[PDB]
Amino acid sequence: RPPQFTRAQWFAIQHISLNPPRCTIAMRAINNYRWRCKNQNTFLRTTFANVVNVCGNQSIRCPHNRTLNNCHRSRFRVPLLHCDLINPGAQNISNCRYADRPGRRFYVVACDNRDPRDSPRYPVVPVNLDTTI
Amino acid sequence: MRPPQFTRAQWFAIQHISLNPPRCTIAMRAINNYRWRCKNQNTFLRTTFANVVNVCGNQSIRCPHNRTLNNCHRSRFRVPLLHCDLINPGAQNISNCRYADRPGRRFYVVACDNRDPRDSPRYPVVPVNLDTTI
């Protein structure tokens, strides 16, 4: 996480996009903050507010980060865009290319208490996209 | 004019909220794909939707740029932003519009209205237009 973003803000940058460009473009926003291109990333085509509501759902064991049980499953599926790295050997991050996989899935988010810099409108916020189902 | 795929609040967010937007020529494609001709100017506020919703609860004022309305609200503090100005209005197609970048930090004025049934219930009153920046 880049220090200038709260965990919730970084979650949104990586995983919330109502209308994302194709992955090779969309992923630049993330990979600019990296030495190596991210192997995979999912953008949920929804709103931050909608994800905050999912933080109020039943807490469960996190599927992909199993040391934690602050995860929450959406009650319904959302449209989304999955991005998969096609050229992992790549020179600089500007040269990374991604395959696009539009889809529609449930999601599982880890949620924590808000950063003091996050709006008091959400006492609890999503901080990781653990997986989609 | 708003694509039917989006509520007024969603279209507001697409046009005007971006915490870390790409340069204008890239950022503006997201908007211009939905337009007959490229937009002459557009500001992206580098803030959160929640912060803009807060502005909706500020004192109601005459809209500076859409003066038939008085459902506007001026922010209490400035936000970083990116302003985009169309460079080549003689562009042959939407695909080739290019924009000059002007980062800044300004107060802003939004028009707000009651939410769409399809908007999150977390915000009964939502921004629907960026009227101007100050």
Own/partner contacts of B62-68, CB < 8 Å, gap of 24 or more, are B63/B109, B63/B111, B63/B129, B63/B131, B64/B109, B64/B131, B64/B132, B65/B131, B65/B132, B66/B111, B66/B129, B66/B131
Best interface-test mutation with B: which of A45, A121, A124, A125 has the largest number of B CBs within 10 A? A121
Chain B residues in contact with A50 by the CB 8 A cut-off are 120
H or E element, residue B73: strand B72-74
Give φ, ψ of A130 to 5 degrees.
-75, -50
Distance of alpha carbon A13 from alpha carbon A7, whole angstroms: 10
Distance of alpha carbon A86 from alpha carbon B30, whole angstroms: 24
Chain A residues in contact with B46 by the CB 8 A cut-off are none
Q: What is the resolution of this structure in A?
A: 1.3
Q: What helix, strand, coil percent values describe chain A, rounded to 5?
A: 20, 30, 45
Nearest Cβ partner of A119 from B10, B26, B50?
Answer: B50
Distance of alpha carbon B11 from alpha carbon A131, whole angstroms: 28
Structural domain boundaries of chain A?
A: 1-133
Tokens found for residue A36:
């190596």
Q: Is A49 within 8 Å of B48 when comparing Cβ atoms?
A: no
Q: Is B48 within 8 Å of A18 when comparing Cβ atoms?
A: no
**Residue of chain A with shortest Cα separation from B47:** A9
User: What is the Rg, in whole angstroms, of the alpha carbon atoms belonging to chain A?
Assistant: 15
Distance of alpha carbon A92 from alpha carbon A11, whole angstroms: 24
- Hey, what's the torsion of the CAs at B68, B74, B78, B79, to 10 degrees? -60
Distance of alpha carbon B123 from alpha carbon A58, whole angstroms: 23
Fold topology of A1-133: P-30 Protein (3.10.130)
Distance of alpha carbon B13 from alpha carbon B119, whole angstroms: 12
Q: Whose structure tokens read 């190596």?
A: A36
Distance of alpha carbon B1 from alpha carbon B24, whole angstroms: 20
A91 contacts: CB under 8 Å, gap ≥ 6:
none
The CATH number of domain B1-134, selected from 3.40.50.300, 3.30.390.10, 3.40.350.10, 3.10.130.10: 3.10.130.10
Q: Is B29 within 8 Å of A21 when comparing Cβ atoms?
A: yes
Give φ, ψ of A112 to 5 degrees.
-140, 170
**Residue of chain A with shortest Cα separation from B21:** A29
